[PDB]
Amino acid sequence: GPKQNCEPDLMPYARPFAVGKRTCSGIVGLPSGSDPAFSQPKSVLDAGLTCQGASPSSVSKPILLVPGTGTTGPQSFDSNWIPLSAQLGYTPCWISPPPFMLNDTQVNTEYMVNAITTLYAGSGNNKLPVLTWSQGGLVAQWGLTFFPSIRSKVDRLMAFAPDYKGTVLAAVSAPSVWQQTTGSALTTALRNAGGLTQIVPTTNLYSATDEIVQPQVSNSPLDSSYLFNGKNVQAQAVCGPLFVIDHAGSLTSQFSYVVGRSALRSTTGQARSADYGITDCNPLPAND
Amino acid sequence: GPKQNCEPDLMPYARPFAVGKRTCSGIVGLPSGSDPAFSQPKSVLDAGLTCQGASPSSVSKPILLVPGTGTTGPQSFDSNWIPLSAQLGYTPCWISPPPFMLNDTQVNTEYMVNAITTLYAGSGNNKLPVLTWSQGGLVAQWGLTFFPSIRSKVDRLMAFAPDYKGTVLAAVSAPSVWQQTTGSALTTALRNAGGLTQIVPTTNLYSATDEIVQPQVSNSPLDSSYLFNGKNVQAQAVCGPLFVIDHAGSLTSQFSYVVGRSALRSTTGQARSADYGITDCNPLPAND
Ligand SMILES: CC(=O)N[C@@H]1[C@@H](O)[C@H](O)[C@@H](CO)O[C@H]1O
Ligand SMILES: CC(=O)N[C@@H]1[C@@H](O)[C@H](O)[C@@H](CO)O[C@H]1O
Ligand SMILES: CC(=O)N[C@@H]1[C@@H](O)[C@H](O)[C@@H](CO)O[C@H]1O
Ligand SMILES: CC(=O)N[C@@H]1[C@@H](O)[C@H](O)[C@@H](CO)O[C@H]1O
């Protein structure tokens, strides 16, 4: 009877299916081959990218904002992170995959991958932060999981109300609505490929009282917004049960701004508990 | 806002991660490329295969028996399925991966894949049944998941006490013992590749009182021996809580023989409830 102190390494054909698990050689990492080809012409993808007061090919300190389902970049962020990030010193940039993020999430991801490639080079080959809302976080993690080239181009991910496990809340529906339904082939694929473990330093801010994305009530790995090794911030864990911000409030509240600002400036790439407390448990809009 | 009645198909790079899920084109099937290469010389794999009273290259109605952890084919089946299958008209054949199924489960699987290739051709290019105990079922499902060529060569799988999710019951250990521990990279890979859904008609007979493989108490998908679309037979569901066969009894009891005989002769490839009832809830050895 032979014996050893580690689990045998998986053969090549099987490792893509155990990302994050530890074998004798160490933790199994994500596959790192070439990027899958885009189904959309690059000119079509470029048309979906915009930066405020600048061209994405020559921009200073860009921050890429990825919108939520049923919205464009301006609709999601005009009243909040476009002006808030500008005030923090970034050039706000965003993608608006047509039509209103309702089409195939895999195509919406092409817009994000192309945007990161563009903004990385456009900012002098420097990593940039990605900030998202709702489906935008699912798109970010899908891109990081399946497009190896951008993993070294994103320095951190600040995701508000991300639905990595989709939602159980919910007939003929938009393509991306089918994909964000819990149990969907898309959410199944993300999990099975190792996507529920962070790839870049990630902060997920969400709320137990989200009326769009559930379940989010456990403050644990069962929550749709949770990523292993990430800085998972369920608002009620910090603020108590009387703090009841909704799906959009998760993006726009003063609490959300304090946590996001912490994540954006942190040298670890993740928000820090030392940067927020009970006094920041403010449900009013940050931009107000 | 566009709308449709199905979830968009996954792009090629992602479908291997959603086997079994339904998209517009239908249910996502397992990848079907070439078989991964063997790490062991074929002559070494052949040395692990034996048939009773015949050569595996020229055999009549073979049945391939895959043993449990810490045993050889004869140790697992001499007192039970070797003589029981012979009495049913098959030529019993078995593999004995060295040493006693304690080495890498991926290598133990090479012995099974090679054996099926050999016995299929050796029996006149006819499909054959595979009957297993313990790790043998994990090996069978691992082979069917990752070696496409044998999917059309196995007509059915009759697995006794299979540990597809490994076991939670359990220091320096044998390679395959690490792999069968719940949470292992190997069991994670099987699940993520779609392996917890049957590939060929499968019957899983197991017991809530298995002292080696747990959990097995729910008579549901949470059980380690459960496969979606399979004929999952938890003994106590049929026989009640006073029926307490153990890990080996799951293989050798009269109840187990009645269910196995049903699976082997069934035109559906799975055991049939109409073939067993309370009278067959006999914990005594079938071969006795
Ligand atoms: C605005 C837009 O891109 N419309 C697309 C259409 O071109 C495409 O045929 C269909 C599925 O590919 O999804 C629609 O939403
Ligand atoms: C289904 C499940 O196990 N998750 C529960 C959730 O239902 C419950 O509301 C929450 C309370 O904080 O605790 C989680 O562990
Ligand atoms: C009987 C046998 O095959 N022994 C093998 C040995 O050859 C191999 O070096 C090691 C890991 O590959 O696993 C052992 O169990
Ligand atoms: C952990 C879990 O949810 N599984 C339970 C199991 O613990 C329980 O013993 C069994 C009773 O039959 O029912 C299952 O659903």
Does B16 contact chain A (CB < 8 Å)?
yes
Is residue B91 a contact partner of residue B20, using CB atoms and an 8 Å limit? no
Coil, helix or strand for B251? helix
B228: Cβ contacts below 8 Å, ≥ 6 apart? B20, B196, B197, B198, B221
Residues β-bridged to residue A66: A132
Give the closest ligand to the alpha carbon of residue A224. 2
Coil, helix or strand for B230? coil
**Does the annotation count B218 as an active-site position?**
no
In chain A, DSSP finds a helix count (H) and a strand count (E) of 10, 9
Give the closest ligand to the alpha carbon of residue B4. 1
**CA of residue B209 to ligand 4 center, whole Å:** 14
Reported residue count of chain A is 288
Distance CA A216, CA A232 (A): 11
**Secondary structure letter of residue B269 according to DSSP:** S
* Helix orientation angle between A135-146 and A105-122, rounded to the nearest 10 degrees: 70
Distance CA A112, CA A130 (A): 10
A212: Cβ contacts below 8 Å, ≥ 6 apart? A134, A161, A167, A169, A247
Coil, helix or strand for A193? coil
A210: Cβ contacts below 8 Å, ≥ 6 apart? A161, A216, A246, A247, A250
Does A214 contact chain B (CB < 8 Å)?
no
Residues β-bridged to residue A4: B173
A27: Cβ contacts below 8 Å, ≥ 6 apart? A20, A21
Distance CA B107, CA B145 (A): 15
Cis amide prior to B215 (ω within 30 degrees): yes
Cα–Cα nearest to A146, from A112, A119, A176, A121:
A112
Cα–Cα nearest to B157, from B25, B63, B52, B17:
B63
Distance CA A1, CA A37 (A): 48
Q: Do B14 and A146 touch (CB under 8 A)?
A: yes
Rg, chain A, Cα only: 19
**E strands present in chain B:** 22-23, 26-27, 49-51, 62-66, 91-95, 128-133, 154-160, 202-206, 231-234
Residue position matching structure tokens 């994050």: A20
Q: How many CB atoms are closer than 10 A to CB B102?
A: 21
Task: Return the structure tokens found at A149.
Answer: 């080239």
Q: Do B102 and A2 touch (CB under 8 A)?
A: yes
Distance CA A189, CA A191 (A): 5
| A47 CB burial (10 A radius; 0-12, 13-18, 19+) | middle
* Helix orientation angle between B135-146 and B105-122, rounded to the nearest 10 degrees: 70
Q: Do B4 and A106 touch (CB under 8 A)?
A: no
Residues of chain B contacting residue A70, judged by C-beta atoms under 8 Å apart: 1
φ, ψ dihedrals at B15, nearest 5°: -60, -35
**CA of residue A221 to ligand 2 center, whole Å:** 10
Coil, helix or strand for B231? strand
Rg, chain B, Cα only: 19
C-alpha count within 13 angstroms, C-beta hemisphere, residue B55: 4
In chain B, DSSP finds a helix count (H) and a strand count (E) of 10, 9
**E strands present in chain A:** 22-23, 26-27, 49-51, 62-66, 91-95, 128-133, 154-160, 202-206, 231-234
| Helices of type H across B53-210 | 73-77, 81-87, 105-122, 135-146, 175-179, 185-192
Give A33 to chain B, closest Cα distance, Å. Answer: 11
Residues β-bridged to residue A154: A128
Task: Return the structure tokens found at B156.
Answer: 């059915």
Distance CA A120, CA A89 (A): 17
- Sheet holding A154-160: strands in order across? A49-51, A91-95, A62-66, A128-133, A154-160, A202-206, A231-234
Q: How many CB atoms are closer than 10 A to CB A61?
A: 14
Is residue B62 a contact partner of residue B119, using CB atoms and an 8 Å limit? yes
Give A30 to chain B, closest Cα distance, Å. Answer: 13
Q: List the Cα angle A84/A85/A88 in 5-degree steps.
A: 95
Distance CA A27, CA A32 (A): 14
B239: Cβ contacts below 8 Å, ≥ 6 apart? B255, B278, B281
Distance CA B250, CA B235 (A): 8
| Helices of type H across chain B | 42-46, 73-77, 81-87, 105-122, 135-146, 175-179, 185-192, 235-239, 249-252, 254-265
| Chain B 229-268, residues with CB within 8 Å of chain A CB atoms | none
**DSSP element (H, E) containing A135:** helix A135-146
Nearest CA to ligand 1 atom 14: A103
Distance CA A8, CA A91 (A): 48
A127: Cβ contacts below 8 Å, ≥ 6 apart? A120, A152, A153, A154, A155
Distance CA B211, CA B190 (A): 23
Distance CA B131, CA B81 (A): 9
Task: Return the structure tokens found at B42.
Answer: 């074929």
Distance CA B66, CA B51 (A): 12
Structure solved using which method?
X-ray
Atom nearest to B174 CA in ligand 3: 15
| B242 CB burial (10 A radius; 0-12, 13-18, 19+) | exposed
**DSSP element (H, E) containing A140:** helix A135-146
Does B170 contact chain A (CB < 8 Å)?
no
Task: Return the structure tokens found at A223.
Answer: 């929550």
**CA of residue B4 to ligand 1 center, whole Å:** 12
| Burial per residue of B219-234, b for 16 or more beta-carbon CB atoms within 10 angstroms, e otherwise | beeebbbbbeebbbbb
Among all residues of A, which ones are annotated catalytic?
A: 134, 210, 247
Query: Using a 6 Å cutoff on CB, does residue B74 contact ligand 3?
Result: no
Cα–Cα nearest to B153, from B139, B138, B143:
B143
Task: Return the structure tokens found at A209.
Answer: 């009282």
Distance CA A19, CA A199 (A): 11
Domains of chain A: 1-288 (3.40.50.1820)
Is residue B111 a contact partner of residue B46, using CB atoms and an 8 Å limit? no
**Secondary structure letter of residue A241 according to DSSP:** T
Distance CA B86, CA B65 (A): 12
Distance CA B84, CA B140 (A): 21
Residues of chain B contacting residue A175, judged by C-beta atoms under 8 Å apart: 2, 4, 7-8
Residues of chain A contacting residue B11, judged by C-beta atoms under 8 Å apart: 36, 39, 106
Classify strands B62-66 and B91-95 as parallel, antiparallel or unpaired. Answer: parallel
Distance CA B206, CA B216 (A): 8
Cis amide prior to B99 (ω within 30 degrees): yes
Reported residue count of chain B is 288
Classify strands A202-206 and A154-160 as parallel, antiparallel or unpaired. Answer: parallel
Q: How many CB atoms are closer than 10 A to CB A238?
A: 18
Q: Do A6 and B70 touch (CB under 8 A)?
A: no
Does B103 contact chain A (CB < 8 Å)?
yes
Distance CA A33, CA B147 (A): 23
Residues of chain A contacting residue B106, judged by C-beta atoms under 8 Å apart: 8, 10-11, 14
